[PDB]
Amino acid sequence: TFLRWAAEPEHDHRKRMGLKMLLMMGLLLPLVYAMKRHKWSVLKSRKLAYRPP
Amino acid sequence: IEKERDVILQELQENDTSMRDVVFNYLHATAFQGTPLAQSVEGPSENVRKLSRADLTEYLSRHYKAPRMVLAAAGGLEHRQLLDLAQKHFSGLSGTYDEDAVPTLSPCRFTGSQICHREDGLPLAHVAIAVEGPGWAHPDNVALQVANAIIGHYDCTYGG
């Protein structure tokens, strides 16, 4: 246990950032994914037709 | 009825070239989707072909009622002269109607949308953008007529 601290003293502080990340990334990913399918929504819903003379 | 049927189909072909009228008709189609206001005054060529005398007598016997109508004039006459003729002639109108013969107008659903009729063969590009308006009676119509007037209007013939 001591040596794992020696070779990786950042261990105990590593994960706390690992925790902060997944909570933020748990939020930003869907929200950004909404703005995407908000702006692209025009195109996923558009329609077309062909009215020659 | 059958003559003017052919005439009006000839008019639509002419109005197919009046690019200005097309845009507003496309415009109302999109602002006011799913409502009557999306319709044109002239309506589709189909109904023009698929119409009857009966459809009209229904339309006339329903809508043309004295309460919804107005006589009015202006110029070198007098009000009192107009009444003596209204009673003489217009006293015979159907001033009444059944319990639910006359419809009423609900508000219509504006919506935000775009219509892009691509035709590169034609040399110029008509455009029309707009939003939802107040209505007739809403008082802020006055202020907006100014705001439009600030922007004004232009053709390539104005010498300013």
From Swiss-Prot, chain A:
It is found in: Mitochondrion inner membrane. Residues 45-53 are mitochondrial matrix. It comes from the Eukaryota. Coiled coil: none annotated. The chain crosses the membrane at residues 11-44. Component of the ubiquinol-cytochrome c oxidoreductase, a multisubunit transmembrane complex that is part of the mitochondrial electron transport chain which drives oxidative phosphorylation. Belongs to the cytochrome c family. Component of the ubiquinol-cytochrome c oxidoreductase (cytochrome b-c1 complex, complex III, CIII), a multisubunit enzyme composed of 11 subunits. The complex is composed of 3 respiratory subunits cytochrome b, cytochrome c1 and Rieske protein UQCRFS1, 2 core protein subunits UQCRC1/QCR1 and UQCRC2/QCR2, and 6 low-molecular weight protein subunits UQCRH/QCR6, UQCRB/QCR7, UQCRQ/QCR8, UQCR10/QCR9, UQCR11/QCR10 and subunit 9, the cleavage product of Rieske protein UQCRFS1. This is Cytochrome c1, heme protein, mitochondrial. The lineage of its organism: Eukaryota, Metazoa, Chordata, Craniata, Vertebrata. The gene is CYC1.
From Swiss-Prot, chain B:
It comes from the Eukaryota. The modification N6-acetyllysine is found at residues 3, 88. The modification N6-succinyllysine is found at residue 3. It is found in: Mitochondrion inner membrane. Signal peptide: none annotated. The modification Phosphoserine is found at residue 52. Belongs to the peptidase M16 family. UQCRC1/QCR1 subfamily. Component of the ubiquinol-cytochrome c oxidoreductase, a multisubunit transmembrane complex that is part of the mitochondrial electron transport chain which drives oxidative phosphorylation. Component of the ubiquinol-cytochrome c oxidoreductase (cytochrome b-c1 complex, complex III, CIII), a multisubunit enzyme composed of 11 subunits. The complex is composed of 3 respiratory subunits cytochrome b, cytochrome c1 and Rieske protein UQCRFS1, 2 core protein subunits UQCRC1/QCR1 and UQCRC2/QCR2, and 6 low-molecular weight protein subunits UQCRH/QCR6, UQCRB/QCR7, UQCRQ/QCR8, UQCR10/QCR9, UQCR11/QCR10 and subunit 9, the cleavage product of Rieske protein UQCRFS1. This is Cytochrome b-c1 complex subunit 1, mitochondrial. It comes from Bos taurus (Bovine). The gene is UQCRC1.
